[PDB]
Design a binder for these strands. Structure first.
Ligand SMILES: Nc1ccn([C@H]2C[C@H](O)[C@@H](COP(=O)(O)OP(=O)(O)OP(=O)(O)O)O2)c(=O)n1
Ligand SMILES: [K+]
Ligand SMILES: [K+]
Ligand SMILES: [K+]
Ligand SMILES: [K+]
Ligand SMILES: [K+]
Ligand SMILES: [K+]
Ligand SMILES: [K+]
Ligand SMILES: [Mg+2]
Ligand SMILES: [Mg+2]
Ligand SMILES: [Mg+2]
Lengths: 566, 432
DNA sequence: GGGACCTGAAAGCGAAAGGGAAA
DNA sequence: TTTCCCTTTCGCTTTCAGGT
């Protein structure tokens, strides 16, 4: 018995049929009468009416749609069943396979008797002088919000016995697009024969004109060979790049092929950055020569790059590369690429630390590998020493969450292949200049700053600066920068501002967020260059601001505070 | 007994995404779902509601399915102190014998109203999305939802409602995870009991006959006070870590800042605060004198003094976890009151090289303790984790899954804004 | 102008919180 | 004692791609 809809309200709604152009009206008539012939639609007397219209298929044929917005608003949603595309890479390499696409899928699945009255419509007359003929759907209308859940449930039940009888067959099912793969051509034939029976028993028809048995196959937007896989779509809009909307179109194009063709987040930095500005789709945007170098590099990668069908018996490995901007991950089986794993260009925090990004990526890519092949990787390769992994397990909460229950191997031996050599790396993975603890036998500098724009340090040498800033924090960051410049030696730094202390201690390995205050971005950027250009290490900590306790650190903090008054 | 439907703040469906799981756990999920399908406790679902599920392997090798019902529970509409003119535990005649049922010993199979089943939905995902997910909904209340106090209290009230009425002479009540039925004559009682046993078995409450206990009010009320009593704790600032100027300056900053709130005169910690005098090098050594030690004991005494004697009886408890060095610290609180401190037993700490594991183990242990003190889970656990880090922990950490099994309260990282609680968060405490 | 459901990515912005001065 | 100074972090809107 088929799945009935739940209705909020029984008050019928009438939405007027709208006019159609001759060519489209003929097509509507052509399809509408054929469904009648098949008994998929029936004459209607219902006080409900929804518009119907046509659009072009890729076939070149037309599609009968029902504009069911007002009717859908009265139907309880069902839960979704397939969050994203299957990956072809998990179809075991060198396995013969067949691709099936059911004919007028939604229309072959019956509606519960009582719901048919609600999916009623008006077909205009070929002639503007002659009256309209009215029908209703007895089958899933293309336009109904639950048609997809119902179609998935119906076909899935039909395929379930095929899955059970051929447990060694790889069977992908997306809505009505279906793949079948087996080890041997004989095993594929037994598998397929069983399938034909079961789809027919459920009253579903295989489109014979559109069956695939032979390389090269096309499935869910991918070109699939015996081993090699690439996106079908081999072209990005690069010609006319004058508006915001033009760049939105090109970057959406590139995004879709990123995961298979291996474009790192840093290689698109210049293109992504041009998206910033006026919200109007028609706002002008200039193509920069850096943005163009980026499009050349993408275009070369489209031609060369690929992913690979895997052995069904071997586990996967995860490689994490210390790439510029943010780490990059590759899911791999020995030398064969499965998928690239990438991080967002824009960030949440002001200061996103590279070690937390590694840990986030390992967690996200572990889940993806688990989704692809049903297990963690047997090995995760990280651009970290034994000692740094040890320190990360002790000190990083993100690393602990990232690698919780990871039973395999962590190591830093990358494949000796040349293929990854092009990837642009960073050396700012972990803090090497910024110290966790005070340095031994080192000068102590004390910094402060005021909303009057004055900044100073004191201790073994003194200085006051007039800074352009009207913030105490911004003034003090200029003091901290001057301290890191004027003490070409190991230094300890004590500041009263939590803010200055956290920024200074975190910038070395940080992704600095693009804030709407450029002035602050320039300051954090200068602070970061200052730390990175150091010859010697430094350590910075917080003193509570106005304690008036005894001791030398209070004394010097009070000197700094006086140096930046009035 | 036609089930009454639950009260909801909103009818807007909440969908929390199921995450991929490895085959072994997907196989275990299908196995357990079929087991429950055969008992008629779940059925196939098309709901727009979804709550995530995960499976925990016992050492037996068997799996148990847990559901994260936080999102669904947050939408339950709480009810008021229904049947408040019913008798209190104090008002029974001490000459009467008392029958004691422990609801933790029992098993609950509470049928849901047709309309409520859809809200308790979940998904088993498919490897690689190669097939549509299998979806299901509970036809009986999932056991975790009993940790909502409202639901539990309402259910037992309805279950006891007819037995109480008919047996006017009998006094039958639900006191803090114990169902009590007591009458003056031993045999007048046994009649009342066996009616009740049969009545609540009809509503879905399995009662364990072996586990049942018998005893007088005076023994009960008196033991109850000793069973659920707050542990007085002579808590101290940890001193072994205090070695350098930098250690003392940080700690004495936080002490001096909280000092007014503790009512310690400014001049009265001069021996302590003078330790800052000397070598300006941050790693230069400093030692507490006996005098300085006695001044630290003033701050410890005031912190000890904040611990309440007895909990308020209406208000739920909360748990704060702090990410202190070595091993994490918990504090049980009832809103702004400090109740009691919670630690891992010190012997076990070196066993867990994953700090995350220790957070999870502490939460499980303290949840049990909180249940002992008040009869319920805390309604909030405050952790040093962002919502994204909580979500990743549920996914990756087996320790986290075990520790937060059947938790339906709030998990967040919003700590109190009271000065004392800010001071405790900045300092490290231990109990010798 | 004209349907449904899913996935991923980008920037910008409004809501709410953290901290620590101000009422 | 709550009730505002900002600033930073989080959630959501609004574009683009893509799948049957
Ligand atoms: N733009 C689209 C494309 C597809 N579908 C849904 C309804 C279709 O029934 C199903 C499969 O799409 P097809 O392209 O296979 O269309 P048909 O099922 O009509 O198949 P065919 O053209 O082979 O008859 O997906 C949809 O609602 N809207
Ligand atoms: K199915
Ligand atoms: K950025
Ligand atoms: K900051
Ligand atoms: K949803
Ligand atoms: K209970
Ligand atoms: K879907
Ligand atoms: K944009
Ligand atoms: Mg089709
Ligand atoms: Mg300062
Ligand atoms: Mg005032």
């Amino acid at each position: 018995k088929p799945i009935p809809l739940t209705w909020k309200t029984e008050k019928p709604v009438w939405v007027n049929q709208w006019p159609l152009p001759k060519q489209k009206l003929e097509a509507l008539h052509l399809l509408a009468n054929e469904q009648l012939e098949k008994g998929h639609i029936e004459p209607s007397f219902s006080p409900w009416n929804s518009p119907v219209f046509v659009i072009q298929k890729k076939s070149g044929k037309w599609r009968m749609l029902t504009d069911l917005r007002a009717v859908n608003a009265l139907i309880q949603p069902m839960g979704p069943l397939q969050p994203g595309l299957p990956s072809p890479a998990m179809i075991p390499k060198d396995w013969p396979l067949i691709i099936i696409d059911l004919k007028d899928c939604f229309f072959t699945i019956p509606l519960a008797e009582q719901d048919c009255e609600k999916f009623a419509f008006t077909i205009p007359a070929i002639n503007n002088k002659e009256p309209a003929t009215r029908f209703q759907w007895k089958v899933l209308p293309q336009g109904m919000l639950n048609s997809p859940t119902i179609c998935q449930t119906f076909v899935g039940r039909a395929l379930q016995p095929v899955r059970e009888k051929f447990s060694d067959c790889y069977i992908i099912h997306y809505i009505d697009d279906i793949l079948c793969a087996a080890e041997t051509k004989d095993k594929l034939i037994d598998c397929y024969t069983f399938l034909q029976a079961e789809v027919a028993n459920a009253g579903l028809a295989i489109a014979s004109d559109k069956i695939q048995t032979s390389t090269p196959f096309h499935y869910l937007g991918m070109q699939i060979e015996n081993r090699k896989i690439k996106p079908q779509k081999i072209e990005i809009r690069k010609d006319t790049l004058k508006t915001l909307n033009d760049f939105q179109k090109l970057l959406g194009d590139i995004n879709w092929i990123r995961p298979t063709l291996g474009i790192p987040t840093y290689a698109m930095s210049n293109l992504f950055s041009i998206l910033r500005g006026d919200s109007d789709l028609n706002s002008k945007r200039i193509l920069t020569p850096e943005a163009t170098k980026e499009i050349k590099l993408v275009e070369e990668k489209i031609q060369s790059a690929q992913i690979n069908r895997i052995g069904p018996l071997a586990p996967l490995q995860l490689l994490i590369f210390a790439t510029a901007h943010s780490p990059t991950g590759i899911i791999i089986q020995n030398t064969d690429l499965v998928e690239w794993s990438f991080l967002p260009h824009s960030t949440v925090k002001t200061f996103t630390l590279y070690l937390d990004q590694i840990a986030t990526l390992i967690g996200q890519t572990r889940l993806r590998i688990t989704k692809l092949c049903g297990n963690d990787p047997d090995k995760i390769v990280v651009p970290l020493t034994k000692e740094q992994v040890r320190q990360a397990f002790i000190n990083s909460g993100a690393w602990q969450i990232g690698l919780a229950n990871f039973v395999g191997i962590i190591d830093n031996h990358y494949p000796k292949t040349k293929i990854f050599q092009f990837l642009k790396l960073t050396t700012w993975i972990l803090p090497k200049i910024t110290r966790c603890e005070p340095l031994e036998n080192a000068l102590t500098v004390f910094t402060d700053g005021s909303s009057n724009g004055k900044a100073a340090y004191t201790g073994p040498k003194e200085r006051v600066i007039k800074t352009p800033y009207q913030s105490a924090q911004r003034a003090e960051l200029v003091a901290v920068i001057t301290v890191l410049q004027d003490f070409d030696q190991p230094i300890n730094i004590i500041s009263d501002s939590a803010y200055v202390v956290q920024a200074t201690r975190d910038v070395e390995t940080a992704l600095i967020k693009y804030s709407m205050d450029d002035q602050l971005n320039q300051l954090f950027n200068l602070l970061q260059q200052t730390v990175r250009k150091r010859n010697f290490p430094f350590y910075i900590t917080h003193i509570r601001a106005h304690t008036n306790l005894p001791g030398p650190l209070t004394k010097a903090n009070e000197q700094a505070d006086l140096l930046v008054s009035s | 007994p036609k089930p009454i439907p639950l009260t909801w703040k909103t009818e807007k469906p909440v969908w929390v995404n199921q995450w991929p799981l490895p085959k072994q756990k997907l196989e275990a999920l299908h196995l357990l779902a079929n087991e429950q399908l055969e008992k008629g406790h779940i059925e196939p679902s098309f709901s727009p509601w979804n709550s995530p599920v995960f499976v925990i392997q016992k050492k037996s090798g068997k799996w148990r399915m847990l559901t994260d019902l936080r999102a669904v529970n947050a939408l339950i509409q709480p009810m008021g102190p229904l049947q408040p003119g019913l008798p209190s535990p104090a008002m029974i005649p001490k000459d009467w014998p008392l029958i004691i049922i422990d609801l933790k010993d029992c098993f609950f199979t509470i049928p849901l109203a047709e309309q409520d089943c859809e809200k308790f939905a979940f998904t088993i995902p498919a490897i690689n999305n190669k097939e549509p997910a299998t979806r299901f909904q509970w036809k009986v209340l999932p056991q975790g939802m009993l940790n909502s106090p409202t639901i539990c209290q309402t259910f037992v009230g309805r279950a006891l409602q007819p037995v109480r009425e008919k047996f006017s002479d009998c006094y039958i009540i639900h006191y803090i995870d114990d169902i009590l039925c007591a009458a003056e004559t031993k045999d007048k009682l046994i009649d009342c009991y066996t009616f009740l046993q049969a009545e609540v078995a009809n509503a879905g409450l399995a009662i364990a006959s072996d586990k049942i206990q018998t005893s007088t009010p005076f023994h009960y009320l008196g033991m109850q006070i000793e069973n659920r009593k707050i542990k007085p704790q002579k808590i101290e600032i940890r001193k072994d870590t205090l070695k350098t100027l930098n250690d003392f300056q940080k700690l004495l900053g936080d002490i001096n800042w909280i000092r007014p709130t503790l009512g310690i005169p400014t001049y009265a910690m001069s021996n302590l605060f003078s330790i800052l005098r000397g070598d300006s090098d941050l790693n230069s050594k400093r030692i507490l004198t006996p005098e300085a030690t006695k001044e630290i004991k003033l701050v410890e005494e005031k912190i000890q003094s904040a611990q309440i004697n007895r909990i308020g009886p209406l208000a739920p408890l909360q748990l704060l976890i702090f990410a202190t060095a070595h091993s994490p610290t918990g504090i049980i609180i009832q809103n702004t009151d400090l109740v009691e401190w919670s630690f891992l037993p010190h012997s076990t700490v070196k066993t867990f090289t994953l700090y995350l594991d220790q957070i999870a183990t502490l939460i499980g242990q303290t949840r049990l303790r909180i249940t002992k003190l008040c009869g319920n889970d805390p309604d909030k656990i405050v952790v040093p984790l962002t919502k994204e880090q909580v979500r990743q922990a549920f996914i990756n950490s087996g320790a986290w899954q075990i520790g937060l099994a059947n938790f339906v309260g709030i998990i967040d990282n919003h700590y109190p804004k009271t000065k004392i609680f800010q001071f405790l968060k900045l300092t490290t405490w231990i109990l010798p």
